[PDB]
Amino acid sequence: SHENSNSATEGSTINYTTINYYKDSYAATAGKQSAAPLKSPSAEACGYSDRVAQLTIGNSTITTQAAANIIVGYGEWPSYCSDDDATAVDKPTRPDVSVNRFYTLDTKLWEKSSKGWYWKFPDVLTETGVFGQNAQFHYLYRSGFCIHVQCNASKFHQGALLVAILPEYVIGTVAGGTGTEDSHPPYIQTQPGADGFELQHPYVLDAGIPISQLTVCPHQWINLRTNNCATIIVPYMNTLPFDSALNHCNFGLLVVPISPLDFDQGATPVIPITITLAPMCSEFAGLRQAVTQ
Amino acid sequence: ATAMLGTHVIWDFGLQSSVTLVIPWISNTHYRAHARDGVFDYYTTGLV
């Protein structure tokens, strides 16, 4: 009562017992603390099977295995911004059928020597559809995503893809190779658009972080013997309630072949990977003239 | 890329052999006459 409630943990659900001799709560000691979101839970695990019984959003419809094969990113469904979490006093627009629909980006071909690609969100959809037009016309943007990476192969084909969602996928460079150049990735590399960008070093994910630990991020496998597609339900993950859709990407979708594609000669050599994705609970605010970038 | 801006289904024909694209009734008028090449293309349902 006699102290300012201005610590970094006010508003949390954790009760902290602390020692403070000053006016401010942040001056106090760290003290004591008086399914699981991180394991890429399924829709059945999160109990969201009712919203998943038919993946039809807007005016689009995809078909896949239900519930168990629907990865909800961090166990949280996309939602509109709550009244307390939002800061902008302007009321947002909710098109909800012209922006919350499945958009099909491109048809990148999986090869035996394929290294992998990444797609930045919502950079992939900035110049596509009513969602793209709302992204250019509005300063503020907020949406979840339902990304459905599709890769059909016969039962004689083999291989696996780590279809993963890396939030705030900052791209690093080779720094001239020797590491003493301080180069920075260009706009076509940081924001490659709907066409995506092929990974130069998928082992370090072009950021100095191993792909072996990419599974701590929301992810799903496209092991060809088991499933032919991966559906990841990504919520809006940002330090802010809203953000610009043009100069900040909330997350990068990593589609990397961990197990290489392999088949004997006579089967179809064209094994394409299709990125179909739907914004969920899309919000736009701060309306002005449309700007591409 | 132009086509996905409209009403669309993505159909995994390997897993499900049959899909149904429901063409929704999207019209200015309550009823549509026969769409024809010419003036009566006003009553077009659109393109699939």
């Binding site: 038919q54 039809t56 959003i57 005016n59 689009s60 059928v97 919350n100 | 009403t7 289904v9 429901v22």
Partner: peptide, 16 residues
């Protein structure tokens, strides 16, 4: 119909 697109309530008083 609703398995394909998000629909609005239309009171279809269309005679058969």
């Amino acid at each position: 119909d609703e398995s394909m697109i998000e629909t609005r309530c239309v009171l279809n008083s269309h005679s058969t």
